Ligand binder design. Structure first.
Ligand SMILES: CC(=O)N[C@@H](Cc1ccc(O)cc1)C(=O)NCC#CBr
Ligand SMILES: CC(=O)N[C@@H](Cc1ccc(O)cc1)C(=O)NCC#CBr
Lengths: 304, 304
């Protein structure tokens, strides 16, 4: 029993982290096969960041200007290219620790683990979600750029995020491993405001199922609702609309607990309208929305 | 910016996890050098668990009855001994992935990372604290026994916990790596109730400092207090007494923020007496107590 914000074991990703230096800027790289992936803003002076022309800045850079260090051993850079907002540094050595991997672009609501790194060295691991506004609420200091987000399916690491920047509101923006930003964000130190950080309704419901499985049942009530009635209340509370697809995805947790998804919706409706009244659910005083239905089943079934 | 419940990178510990089977029971082992450490209850039938005599049960066990598997490779057991509540299985092969390590016995309030494992395979990593009642609030299913808790200082893993059992209240009990239980718990399926789970005051204050550093300042007030006045309020709210030693330990965060520890105590006093009024601090609706002053400085300074 018990339910924790749980990250994937980070070992497979620790084995891929390197240091990238361009001029005075040091940040992190991901070394997979003979390619090191890093934020293209590694080439920017702090001046450049206000209005960078990456193609023009890149003309002034040669292979030998990209200093790549794996542990305390230097890698030889034999090629470099820009793909969207990432640089791909071709090195002469395949990472011997390259795991089986994929690059995936996740949807808002999806969760992943972050291995926070500084100078190519792992600092810590924590669990995040892609917010509905395409920000993530990370823990990232200056030097953490190039830190990556991932999921593991058995022995295959799906890389979904690379850390690029912090907005003036202290929320985080980054790319997939093809260098495309999540959301409308750009790698420029300009005014960029995030939109509404809505609550991931399907994730809250998953977590309420987690709570029932783990013996936390006080919030279960005598009511049901409909998708349309629930959604009226969800919109009022800046919750994402619930779709039949979400209902279908909760099907396993519905079956395991014997609680109809629309009955759990009616419980969530009352929690929104009435609050927690100083009570807690799985040790939280607010409704947690960074566990997916897949996460709750994984953690409640002990997948490795 | 940002502040997350962050675990140590688990790679160094993933490299030590093995499967231990005795008869029909499979659980996890920790392989360091040529010794595999596991809960002695691996030798128990579900019947045995009600009133086990471990010395008597162990007489019926030989080296060849302890099946140890590292990945999908079998280790040869050449010796076994009981130390307190752990078994030490001597194997013929030194773990080639043995990190630099120590066994430490932590105090209540201290935090550590858990690598939850099933069948010797890492499932996930999360952060815990030794509660004042010597329980931990983990996420552990049946098969998770032998999963370990640890801290890393640079390249040295300090192992502090091995998971042994879940109490009927779904809280967790375990040993240090010398096999001594934290608190009064025993490896028998008998009535064992935990005492008062008090709040780790110094940890709450550390986290309030974390909040100020990360721009969350609404709870800072115009008041101060004294240790004795604060402690009167702490006791009333089942908070641990604050000592001068705690004040001294917060000194770094006091200095970094310019907020006197007793001023932050007066802020915490008002939060206890008045509640959050539906507000949040670092995304929490309750006062977080599983970050140590050391954790807050580490995460706010980016130690690797
Ligand atoms: C608001 C601010 O200082 N952002 C800086 C520095 C910084 C980066 C990551 C982080 O997690 C915290 C701070 C930034 O975004 N630099 C990278 C770029 C580009 Br183009
Ligand atoms: C209440 C209950 O079923 N406890 C069992 C099974 C169990 C173990 C760990 C866990 O995390 C969840 C469940 C138990 O404590 N077995 C180990 C011993 C001894 Br001696």
């Amino acid at each position: 029993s018990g339910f924790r914000k749980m990250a994937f074991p980070s070992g497979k990703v620790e084995g891929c982290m390197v240091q990238v230096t361009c001029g005075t800027t040091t940040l992190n790289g991901l070394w997979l096969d003979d390619v090191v992936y890093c934020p293209r803003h590694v080439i920017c002076t702090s001046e450049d960041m206000l209005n960078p022309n990456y193609e023009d800045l890149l003309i002034r850079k040669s292979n030998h200007n990209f200093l790549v260090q794996a542990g305390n051993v230097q890698l030889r850079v034999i090629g470099h290219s820009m793909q969207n907002c990432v640089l791909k540094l071709k090195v002469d050595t395949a990472n011997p620790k390259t795991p089986k991997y994929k690059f995936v672009r996740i949807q808002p609501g999806q969760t992943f683990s972050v291995l926070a790194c500084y100078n190519g060295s792992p600092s810590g691991v924590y669990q995040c979600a892609m917010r509905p506004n395409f920000t993530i609420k990370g823990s990232f200091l200056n030097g953490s750029c190039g830190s990556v987000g991932f999921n593991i399916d058995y022995d295959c690491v799906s890389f979904c995020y690379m850390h690029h920047m912090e907005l003036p509101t202290g929320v985080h923006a980054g790319t997939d491993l093809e260098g495309n930003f999540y959301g409308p964000f750009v790698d420029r130190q300009t005014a960029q405001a995030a939109g509404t950080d809505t609550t991931i309704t399907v994730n809250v419901l998953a977590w309420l199922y987690a709570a029932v499985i783990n013996g936390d049942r006080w919030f279960l009530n005598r009511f049901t609702t409909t998708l349309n009635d629930f959604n009226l209340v969800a919109m009022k509370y800046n919750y994402e609309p619930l779709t039949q697809d979400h209902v279908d995805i909760l099907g396993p947790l519905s079956a395991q607990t014997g609680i109809a998804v629309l009955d759990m919706c009616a419980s969530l409706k009352e929690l929104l309208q009435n609050g927690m009244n100083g009570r807690t659910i799985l040790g939280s005083a607010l409704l947690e929305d960074e566990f997916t239905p897949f996460d709750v089943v994984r953690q409640c079934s002990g997948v490795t």
